[PDB]
């Protein structure tokens, strides 16, 4: 039933935010995974939702250029990766099993992040990373996970 | 199915059809009383008949010894159309 997704989208949405959760949610969404099958028009909706959420997240990334955009970008990327991992682990059956962006949820998230990173924020992130590297090489040392996150990304 | 005779072998046996009904009776083993009769090997015996006497046999391509690459050149060829003695 298509009417279940509009009510169940909150379960996936709250995954992006880090807090407590109910153990039954995993089984609740896992049942709806195969209960959806109609049963094919789901990839486009998921792609649109991911794209709009990613654009909304990137929109609040302009007022920070250095020493603040790095922490924010790293933590948002960690949250996005965690949400993508949860989505892959909770629904990985009705994606490409029947015959055949890449259909895989992890690959879809990766390609969306790749083709969204082409925005001018890449230049400012690179400039921040370079200036942090020069500041570290000047003699002082600071935390390393901030740019390590984007490196692993 | 197995036939020890050579010059009077059952036509069904040479064609690969083990099961036949009253085929031997319909098919004079030696009437010529000479060496002109086609006494040959297992395949050469049928080759001699094919050379001598060239739709005609419905359902011919359904036997173990009925190949499709063969050349073109009370005795009855059809086993079903055989008159009893």
């Amino acid at each position: 039933l298509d009417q279940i997704w509009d009510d169940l989208r909150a379960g996936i949405q709250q995954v992006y935010t880090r807090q407590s959760m109910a153990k039954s949610r995993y089984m609740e969404l896992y049942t709806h995974v195969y209960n959806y099958c109609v049963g094919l028009e789901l990839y486009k909706r998921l792609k649109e939702f991911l794209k709009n959420y990613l654009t909304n997240l990137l929109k609040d990334g302009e007022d920070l250029m250095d020493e603040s955009v790095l922490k924010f970008y790293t933590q948002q990327w960690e949250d996005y990766r965690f949400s993508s991992k949860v989505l892959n682990g909770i629904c990985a059956y009705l994606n490409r099993h029947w015959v055949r962006g890449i259909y895989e949820i992890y690959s879809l998230a990766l390609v969306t992040w790749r083709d969204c990173l082409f925005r001018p924020l890449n230049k400012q992130v690179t400039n921040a990373v370079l200036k942090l590297i020069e500041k570290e090489r000047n003699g002082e040392t600071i935390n390393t996970r901030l740019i390590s996150g984007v490196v692993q990304s | 199915h197995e036939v020890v005779t050579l010059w009077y072998r059952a036509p069904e046996i040479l064609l690969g059809c083990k099961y036949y009904s009253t085929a031997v009776d319909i098919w004079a083993e030696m009437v010529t009383r000479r060496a002109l009769f086609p006494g040959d090997s297992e395949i050469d015996q049928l080759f001699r008949i094919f050379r001598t006497l060239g739709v005609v046999w419905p359902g011919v391509t359904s036997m173990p010894d009925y190949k499709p690459s063969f050349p073109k050149w009370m005795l009855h060829y059809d086993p079903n159309k055989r008159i009893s003695a």
Binding site: - | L14, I43, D44, W73
Partner: protein, 64 residues
């Protein structure tokens, strides 16, 4: 051993039946037919095929 037969056919082709000893029949494989230079042990063109019910038959080919 070598066997001989009349080289007569209704069409323009020509064929002759040949036979080989049982000892040499082991080398001949039922899967793949022999070639021009393969059949040299007998000491006697290419091996075309064999007989359907019989296990030993050779015809050979003659090119124009």
């Amino acid at each position: 051993q070598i066997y001989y037969s009349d080289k007569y056919d209704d069409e323009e082709f020509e064929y002759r039946h040949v036979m080989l000893p049982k000892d040499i029949a082991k080398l001949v494989p039922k899967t793949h037919l022999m070639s021009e230079s393969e059949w040299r042990n007998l000491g006697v063109w290419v091996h075309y095929m064999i007989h359907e019910p019989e296990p030993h038959i050779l015809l050979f080919r003659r090119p124009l």
